[PDB]
Design a protein around this motif. Structure first.
Motif, PDB file in Angstrom:
ATOM      1  N   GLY A 163       6.442   3.041  17.012  1.00  0.00           N
ATOM      2  CA  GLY A 163       6.397   2.747  18.426  1.00  0.00           C
ATOM      3  C   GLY A 163       5.063   2.276  18.954  1.00  0.00           C
ATOM      4  N   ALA A 164       4.042   2.261  18.105  1.00  0.00           N
ATOM      5  CA  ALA A 164       2.690   1.944  18.560  1.00  0.00           C
ATOM      6  C   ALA A 164       2.446   0.443  18.536  1.00  0.00           C
ATOM      7  CB  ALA A 164       1.643   2.673  17.713  1.00  0.00           C
ATOM      8  N   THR A 165       1.854  -0.049  19.614  1.00  0.00           N
ATOM      9  CA  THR A 165       1.441  -1.443  19.694  1.00  0.00           C
ATOM     10  C   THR A 165       0.007  -1.511  20.199  1.00  0.00           C
ATOM     11  OG1 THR A 165       2.363  -1.697  21.947  1.00  0.00           O
ATOM     12  CG2 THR A 165       3.787  -2.323  20.097  1.00  0.00           C
ATOM     13  N   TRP A 166      -0.601  -2.678  20.067  1.00  0.00           N
ATOM     14  CA  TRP A 166      -1.955  -2.872  20.556  1.00  0.00           C
ATOM     15  C   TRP A 166      -2.112  -4.294  21.046  1.00  0.00           C
ATOM     16  CZ3 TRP A 166      -5.284  -6.383  18.105  1.00  0.00           C
ATOM     17  CH2 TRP A 166      -4.803  -6.907  16.904  1.00  0.00           C
ATOM     18  N   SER A 186       0.827  -1.202   0.000  1.00  0.00           N
ATOM     19  CA  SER A 186       0.000   0.000   0.000  1.00  0.00           C
ATOM     20  C   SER A 186       0.862   1.252   0.000  1.00  0.00           C
ATOM     21  CB  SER A 186      -0.902   0.042   1.228  1.00  0.00           C
ATOM     22  OG  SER A 186      -1.591   1.277   1.254  1.00  0.00           O
ATOM     23  N   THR A 187       0.678   2.099  -1.006  1.00  0.00           N
ATOM     24  CA  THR A 187       1.510   3.287  -1.150  1.00  0.00           C
ATOM     25  C   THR A 187       1.134   4.369  -0.145  1.00  0.00           C
ATOM     26  OG1 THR A 187       0.066   4.145  -2.899  1.00  0.00           O
ATOM     27  CG2 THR A 187       1.988   2.852  -3.564  1.00  0.00           C
ATOM     28  N   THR A 188      -0.006   4.199   0.519  1.00  0.00           N
ATOM     29  CA  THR A 188      -0.463   5.168   1.511  1.00  0.00           C
ATOM     30  C   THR A 188      -0.252   4.677   2.954  1.00  0.00           C
ATOM     31  OG1 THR A 188      -2.687   4.360   0.971  1.00  0.00           O
ATOM     32  CG2 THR A 188      -2.085   6.523   0.133  1.00  0.00           C
ATOM     33  N   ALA A 189       0.244   3.458   3.129  1.00  0.00           N
ATOM     34  CA  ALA A 189       0.493   2.932   4.471  1.00  0.00           C
ATOM     35  C   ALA A 189       1.726   3.589   5.080  1.00  0.00           C
ATOM     36  CB  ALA A 189       0.699   1.440   4.419  1.00  0.00           C
ATOM     37  N   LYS A 190       1.647   3.898   6.362  1.00  0.00           N
ATOM     38  CA  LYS A 190       2.786   4.405   7.108  1.00  0.00           C
ATOM     39  C   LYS A 190       2.802   3.750   8.483  1.00  0.00           C
ATOM     40  N   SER A 245      -8.403 -13.127  21.803  1.00  0.00           N
ATOM     41  CA  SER A 245      -7.450 -12.030  21.892  1.00  0.00           C
ATOM     42  C   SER A 245      -6.625 -11.886  20.618  1.00  0.00           C
ATOM     43  CB  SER A 245      -6.513 -12.241  23.081  1.00  0.00           C
ATOM     44  OG  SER A 245      -5.753 -13.426  22.910  1.00  0.00           O
ATOM     45  N   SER A 246      -5.980 -10.730  20.476  1.00  0.00           N
ATOM     46  CA  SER A 246      -5.072 -10.477  19.370  1.00  0.00           C
ATOM     47  C   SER A 246      -4.182  -9.296  19.744  1.00  0.00           C
ATOM     48  CB  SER A 246      -5.850 -10.215  18.082  1.00  0.00           C
ATOM     49  OG  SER A 246      -6.833  -9.219  18.289  1.00  0.00           O
ATOM     50  N   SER A 247      -3.062  -9.143  19.044  1.00  0.00           N
ATOM     51  CA  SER A 247      -2.122  -8.062  19.334  1.00  0.00           C
ATOM     52  C   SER A 247      -1.182  -7.840  18.157  1.00  0.00           C
ATOM     53  CB  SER A 247      -1.304  -8.375  20.589  1.00  0.00           C
ATOM     54  OG  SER A 247      -0.549  -9.577  20.431  1.00  0.00           O
ATOM     55  N   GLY A 248      -0.547  -6.676  18.114  1.00  0.00           N
ATOM     56  CA  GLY A 248       0.401  -6.390  17.059  1.00  0.00           C
ATOM     57  C   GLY A 248       0.890  -4.967  17.048  1.00  0.00           C
ATOM     58  N   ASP A 249       1.206  -4.478  15.854  1.00  0.00           N
ATOM     59  CA  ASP A 249       1.668  -3.106  15.670  1.00  0.00           C
ATOM     60  C   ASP A 249       0.667  -2.341  14.809  1.00  0.00           C
ATOM     61  OD1 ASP A 249       2.311  -4.176  13.171  1.00  0.00           O
ATOM     62  OD2 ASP A 249       4.469  -4.236  13.609  1.00  0.00           O
ATOM     63  N   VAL A 250       0.999  -1.120  14.404  1.00  0.00           N
ATOM     64  CA  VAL A 250      -0.013  -0.209  13.877  1.00  0.00           C
ATOM     65  C   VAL A 250       0.508   0.561  12.670  1.00  0.00           C
ATOM     66  CG1 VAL A 250      -1.643   1.648  14.450  1.00  0.00           C
ATOM     67  CG2 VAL A 250      -0.859   0.124  16.239  1.00  0.00           C
ATOM     68  N   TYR A 251      -0.333   0.651  11.647  1.00  0.00           N
ATOM     69  CA  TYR A 251      -0.101   1.507  10.494  1.00  0.00           C
ATOM     70  C   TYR A 251      -1.212   2.537  10.444  1.00  0.00           C
ATOM     71  CZ  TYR A 251       3.265  -1.937   9.074  1.00  0.00           C
ATOM     72  OH  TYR A 251       4.367  -2.749   9.024  1.00  0.00           O
ATOM     73  N   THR A 252      -0.967   3.655   9.779  1.00  0.00           N
ATOM     74  CA  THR A 252      -2.078   4.487   9.327  1.00  0.00           C
ATOM     75  C   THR A 252      -2.228   4.264   7.827  1.00  0.00           C
ATOM     76  OG1 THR A 252      -0.676   6.452   9.080  1.00  0.00           O
ATOM     77  CG2 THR A 252      -1.914   6.189  11.154  1.00  0.00           C
ATOM     78  N   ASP A 253      -3.465   4.289   7.346  1.00  0.00           N
ATOM     79  CA  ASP A 253      -3.717   4.082   5.930  1.00  0.00           C
ATOM     80  C   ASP A 253      -5.118   4.598   5.619  1.00  0.00           C
ATOM     81  OD1 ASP A 253      -2.635   1.247   3.830  1.00  0.00           O
ATOM     82  OD2 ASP A 253      -3.299   3.267   3.290  1.00  0.00           O
ATOM     83  N   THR A 254      -5.445   4.608   4.339  1.00  0.00           N
ATOM     84  CA  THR A 254      -6.765   4.996   3.874  1.00  0.00           C
ATOM     85  C   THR A 254      -7.723   3.827   3.988  1.00  0.00           C
ATOM     86  OG1 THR A 254      -5.731   6.551   2.386  1.00  0.00           O
ATOM     87  CG2 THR A 254      -8.026   5.913   1.893  1.00  0.00           C
ATOM     88  N   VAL A 255      -8.878   4.080   4.601  1.00  0.00           N
ATOM     89  CA  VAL A 255      -9.887   3.058   4.831  1.00  0.00           C
ATOM     90  C   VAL A 255     -11.217   3.556   4.313  1.00  0.00           C
ATOM     91  CG1 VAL A 255     -11.167   1.760   6.599  1.00  0.00           C
ATOM     92  CG2 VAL A 255      -8.705   2.063   6.793  1.00  0.00           C
TER      93      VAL A 255
END
Length: 330
Positions: free
Chosen positions: A72-75, A64-68, A84-94
Motif C-alpha cells: 500500500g505504500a507509495t511515494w 532479491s530474496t530479501t525484498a518485500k 521529480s519521481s514517484s513509485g512504490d516501496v520495498y523493504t530490503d537490505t542496503v
C-alpha cells in the motif's frame, strides 16, 4: 559499526557525486546521489517506465530474496530544481561501504522526470536529511542514516567531497587524518527537516570579512552555492565582465577570468573556497561565457551550501539527540 564509501564526481565539472550502494540479496550495486537535502532512498528499477530509462542500472526486486513489497505504500517527490519521481516501496537490505541496514525502505521508481532520465550516471538518490521529510505514504519511512544510527559507533556521518577528484562518505566515525586543524561545530535547526545552520559571514578574495548571519542548509545534493543577492553581487563585482543573465539563468563570466576565492564563516572559523571551485565552464559547448558556481538564492526561499561550498571542507553531520554540524579545512 561503521561504513566508508568513496564518492566520485559524475563529470569533469563535479555536477554531482555518485556513491556505490549494495541493495538486496544477492547484492545489486547501484550508484546513488547521496543527498543531505532530502530524505528518500529511491532507485531506477524494473518498474520504471521503459522510455524513462536511458543507461541507468536498475534495481529488480523480484531477483532479491530479501525484498518485500511494503503493501500500500507509495511515494512522490519534487526537488528544488523542478525534477521529480514517484513509485512504490520495498523493504530490503542496503549496505554502504560495509555498513548494513536490514529492512530499509527502497523506493522503486515507476516514473521519473526528464532530468533523471537524461543523466545516465545516477541510478537514484539516497537521502540524508531528517526523516520528517520522507515522502512515503501512508506510513513515513526512515532514512538509511536514521536506521543505522543506533548501531553506529558514533551517531554521525561525514562528507568529504573532492574537487575534480573522488572523496569519501563515512558513517559512524570521524577520520581525524582527513582534515587539517580543528573541526568547528555549529548549531542546527531541524524545523524544516534540513541540516540548517547559520554562517557567521563571508569574504571575497583577499577582502575584509563581513560579519553577517546567513541561514542556510548543508546540501550535498545541490551542485552550487546559493546565497543572498547582496552577497552574490559583491562576489561577482570582483570579476571583470561578470553579469547576471536572465536568458542563461544566473551569473556568467568571461571564461578568460581568474576567479577570486570566497570565504564563509563557521563560528569564528573560516572555510575558503578557491576561485577555481566556482568555475562551471562554458554555458554551451565552445562558448567563451562561463557559468558561475555562486548564484542568488532569491526566489528559492532558502540559502543553500551546496557542493561548491561543502567540497572545500570536511563536514560532520552529527546526529546526536541535539544535532549539530561540524566544518574543518582540509
Amino acid at each position: 559499526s561503521t561504513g566508508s564509501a568513496t564518492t566520485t564526481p559524475i563529470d569533469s565539472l563535479d555536477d554531482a557525486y555518485i556513491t556505490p550502494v549494495q541493495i538486496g540479496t544477492p547484492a545489486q550495486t547501484l550508484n546513488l546521489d547521496f543527498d543531505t537535502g532530502s530524505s528518500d532512498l529511491w532507485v531506477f528499477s524494473s518498474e520504471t517506465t521503459a522510455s524513462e530509462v536511458d543507461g541507468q542500472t536498475i534495481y529488480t526486486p523480484s531477483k532479491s530474496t530479501t525484498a518485500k513489497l511494503l503493501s500500500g505504500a507509495t511515494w512522490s517527490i519534487s526537488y528544488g530544481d523542478g525534477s521529480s519521481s514517484s513509485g512504490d516501496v520495498y523493504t530490503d537490505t542496503v549496505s554502504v561501504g560495509g555498513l548494513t541496514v536490514t529492512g530499509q525502505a527502497v523506493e522503486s521508481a515507476k516514473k521519473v522526470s526528464s532530468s533523471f532520465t537524461e543523466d545516465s550516471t545516477i541510478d537514484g538518490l539516497l537521502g540524508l536529511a531528517f526523516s520528517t521529510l520522507n515522502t512515503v505514504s501512508p506510513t513515513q519511512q526512515k532514512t538509511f542514516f536514521d536506521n543505522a544510527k543506533a548501531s553506529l559507533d558514533s551517531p554521525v556521518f561525514t562528507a568529504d567531497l573532492g574537487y575534480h577528484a573522488p572523496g569519501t562518505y563515512n558513517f559512524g566515525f570521524i577520520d581525524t587524518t582527513a582534515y587539517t586543524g580543528s573541526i568547528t561545530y555549529t548549531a542546527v535547526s531541524t524545523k524544516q527537516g534540513f541540516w540548517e545552520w547559520t554562517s557567521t559571514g563571508y569574504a571575497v578574495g583577499s577582502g575584509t570579512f563581513k560579519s553577517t548571519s546567513i541561514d542556510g542548509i548543508a546540501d550535498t545534493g545541490t551542485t552550487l552555492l546559493y546565497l543572498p543577492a547582496t552577497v552574490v553581487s559583491a562576489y561577482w563585482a570582483q570579476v571583470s565582465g561578470a553579469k547576471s543573465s536572465s536568458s542563461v539563468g544566473g551569473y556568467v563570466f568571461p571564461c578568460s577570468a581568474t576567479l577570486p576565492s570566497f570565504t564563509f564563516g563557521v563560528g569564528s572559523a573560516r572555510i575558503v573556497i578557491p576561485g577555481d571551485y566556482i568555475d562551471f565552464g562554458p554555458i554551451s559547448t565552445g562558448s567563451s561565457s562561463c557559468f558561475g558556481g555562486i548564484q542568488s538564492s532569491a526566489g528559492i526561499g532558502i540559502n543553500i551550501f551546496g557542493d561548491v561550498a561543502l567540497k572545500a571542507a570536511f563536514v560532520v553531520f552529527n546526529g546526536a539527540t541535539t544535532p549539530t554540524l561540524g566544518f574543518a579545512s582540509k
